[PDB]
Nucleic acid binder design. Sequence first.
DNA 1: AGTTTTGTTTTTTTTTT
DNA 2: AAACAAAACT
RNA 3: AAAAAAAAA
DNA 4: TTTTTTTTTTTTTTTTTTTTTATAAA
DNA 5: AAAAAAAAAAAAAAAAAAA
DNA 6: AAAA
Length: 1025
Amino acid sequence: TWKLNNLLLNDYWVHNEMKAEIKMFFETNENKDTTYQNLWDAFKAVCRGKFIALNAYKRKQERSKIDTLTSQLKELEKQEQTHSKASRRQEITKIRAELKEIETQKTLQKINESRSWFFERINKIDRPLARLIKKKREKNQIDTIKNDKGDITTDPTEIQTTIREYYKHLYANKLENLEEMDTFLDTYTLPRLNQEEVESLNRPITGSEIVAIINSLPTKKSPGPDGFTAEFYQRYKEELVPFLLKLFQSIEKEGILPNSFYEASIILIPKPGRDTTKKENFRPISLMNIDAKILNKILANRIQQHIKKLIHHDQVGFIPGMQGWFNIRKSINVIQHINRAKDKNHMIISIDAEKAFDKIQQPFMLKTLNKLGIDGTYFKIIRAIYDKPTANIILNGQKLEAFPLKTGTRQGCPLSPLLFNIVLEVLARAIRQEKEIKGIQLGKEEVKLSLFADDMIVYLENPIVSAQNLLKLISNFSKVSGYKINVQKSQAFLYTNNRQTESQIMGELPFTIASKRIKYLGIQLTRDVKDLFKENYKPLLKEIKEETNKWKNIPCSWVGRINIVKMAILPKVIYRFNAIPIKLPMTFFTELEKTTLKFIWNQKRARIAKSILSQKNKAGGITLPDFKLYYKATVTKTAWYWYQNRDIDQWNRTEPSEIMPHIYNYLIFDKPEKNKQWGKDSLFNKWCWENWLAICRKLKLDPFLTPYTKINSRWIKDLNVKPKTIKTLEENLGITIQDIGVGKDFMSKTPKAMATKDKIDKWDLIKLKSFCTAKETTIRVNRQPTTWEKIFATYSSDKGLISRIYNELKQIYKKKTNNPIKKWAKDMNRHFSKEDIYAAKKHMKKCSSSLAIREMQIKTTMRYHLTPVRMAIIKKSGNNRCWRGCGEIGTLLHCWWDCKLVQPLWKSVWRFLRDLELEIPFDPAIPLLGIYPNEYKSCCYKDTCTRMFIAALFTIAKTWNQPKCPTMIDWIKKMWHIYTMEYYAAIKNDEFISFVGTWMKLETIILSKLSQEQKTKHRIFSLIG
DNA sequence: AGTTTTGTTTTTTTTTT
DNA sequence: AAACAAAACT
RNA sequence: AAAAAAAAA
DNA sequence: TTTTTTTTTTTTTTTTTTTTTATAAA
DNA sequence: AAAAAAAAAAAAAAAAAAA
DNA sequence: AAAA
Ligand SMILES: [Zn+2]
């Protein structure tokens, strides 16, 4: 079955013919007999046909010469076989050689092209490095599977039948009781969209909307069953988008889809560590056509605008701007409340939904949309999409016969996640509204539910009544919706005053009772909150220790191993900090850093100090992750939510408020509080406050009255001013005291303020006039804000907040280090200006795109290499002399520059620079460090010199302790290797004008010095010419 | 008059369902 | 993490 | 080897 | 209830102790 | 020669007792 | 070598 191979899109001739036929198809074809839906499927057939014609022709053309020579040789060899003479064997000898020349040249090019691709990526956080740490990828092929007989089979036709029949049954059964659905939907109170909102859904599609979706499609994804890729639509969006608009407008008008929109391919993937004998162990994934995903993406974006009107904030899955940790922290706070309570009669239930996305009944889903008030053009298009979807299984690369999808949301569809949530919201609203299912009361807060997609946790009081009523309600929803739970797989914590009462409740209820812990949303919830460290963080250390112990022999430099820690370990560490930000002992961070460094330095002591790696200006932009500062950044981030004071944030309100509530709304940028007895038992919030204050005093800020203090603050409320005055000021003039104005500004700065000024209570204005015009209030409020203050006050989005705080903490907690560049300046008798030390650092960043070439320079500048001087100190044995055996003290400058065995190579390099006709002094700082004197700092040739010198550095380092000269031919070979890698990259990324500038003059010199014997032996020949 | 800093944009991988 | 463009500070 | 949201580099 | 003094913890700096056997390619 | 670890000193917060 |  055909797929477009994306490489064809690159090729300027193939591209030109497609543009010709795309225009020519449509302008020929458009006549009033076809519907536009039929005309679109006809267009796709012609395109698929033409791509086959172009691929076949191109392959035939590229081979044409070897095709000819094979014939030409074969008749001459048969002419000899009939009539033999020596010159026929001469001719055979020549042509058969040229056959070998052509065939090897093609073999080289493919090997050099793949090497070039790897050369750009090596040691970078990219798919090659990701694959290195992963296991070997298990093949799709399925040899053997079991029958429901309890029997085992290997016959291909039996296994094809048994898989297909199983999936065909799951999707088959559509409910018919529509009258009973309407009753359930009427029973409860549900939201509605207003007119203005409904006008937004039903508005006509436009071209700008389509191109915005095309531009954002992910690249390198599998195509659907018609085999066109996202890269095709991106490439021809100029010609296609006019016709795509005509298609969607015809769908709006008529409610009819093209037949291809219904098709999908199901691929089966085996589950890890699971027994392939059983069909249940595979997981399906569905591939839909890209044109159908474009339409579905349009619809999902429209409904996403409204979704916060429809869905309560107890649901956080798939919702823009919500966080999964909101439910984790709320749940831990509920468990603490129960642990503290004197009378315990409570239950916490984690509910196991079964295959929820597949089992939703489509008629109930469409009725739900009407009750929320979605109807018209938007509802008509959604109804068309569910009219007749079908799937084909693809097993062992073989396409099985299709079956209808009569239940479920479409498993690979943009629109399915939100449609599932909207249906589940009907159940969530029923549970909240039923007063005989009792929630848990936390001061002014009641908590019943938290949801994440289909995952559900429930918090109940008086369980023996309350849990029975919950099960009844779910049974009723199951009948109409199709949604189903496995009650024995569901786990609960049960709290009772004594064990007789426990035995009774357990007798009646079906659930599995958990004694220590329950896995939830990636973490462990514990029955007592005192065990959070033991169940969450002690295991996380053990997991990282064993994971790095597996990797220890991977073929990777210290540069690549640093990137492994950032790629694999850092994300799971951050996730655990963000879910459970409890006070952690210092030993946790000591074990974590020791483990991580021991891996990076391959169990030998560090070659470069962690303090130099700490900072991005040093070591050419290679940097080591600081886990203490990521921890501190995560703990402090909570203060942003306190200042925002949002009603969606109920996780923040759920902590014990025994002494005094609401204190967190007042803390940030506001008057200090007399009493310290608040927050006595706080798990999260009291520790957040202590970290916030410590950073403010490290900055020597005054945190308590600021250019960002609110009008809704203790500062104003300690004045006795009526709440109507406060709300008047916010509604008219904005929310900061600075928006009022202090001192001479007090209202005068705008006419809107003095327009407001008359409106306020006579006596309140005198109180406010006194405070705002005082000397200290003017001084404190008028100062310029720091970048730290700007983070918490200014930003409307929580996005990016850990990375923003972490970059500040790096500047604040910065520490002093030795500089290797200074030691080099002592090693030579010279002083480097601050401008030279800057050039050394910039060169170390910009000498290459490849980390392979950059690493060699970084090691040279940062004094990586061992020397006999250093080695004699370590062994404390006084032989400090040069391993090469010239009879001299082996300083690092001797090893690189001065040794008489190395000196003939560096003189060779200087002969090439004179053939380039550059006049450059013979100074060790230019090749070793990239420090040019002031005349040459700007020059146009530095790109060339950088390649010559780094090639020479490789050549010396390869024989570091060997008693022989490095040789000119080894240097030429290394330099030509780099040339080859850069050439294929320069084509692939269309940089070729730059490449020719750098290499062209150097290439001419390298070729002029070699003999044809040497060029043949080492395959040195031009790729430009 | 030039260089440096700050923010957005395009590209990778990992967390949950 | 990289690159590119705009504005302020040296 | 697909969909959604979130996070980092 | 606030003020004053002492005690405890955390962080920063200084000083001492111990090391690895060549490197790049893979 | 160079990096990391360990100990000592300094500062700030909390508690205890008296005014 | 460490991709599809
Ligand atoms: Zn020597």
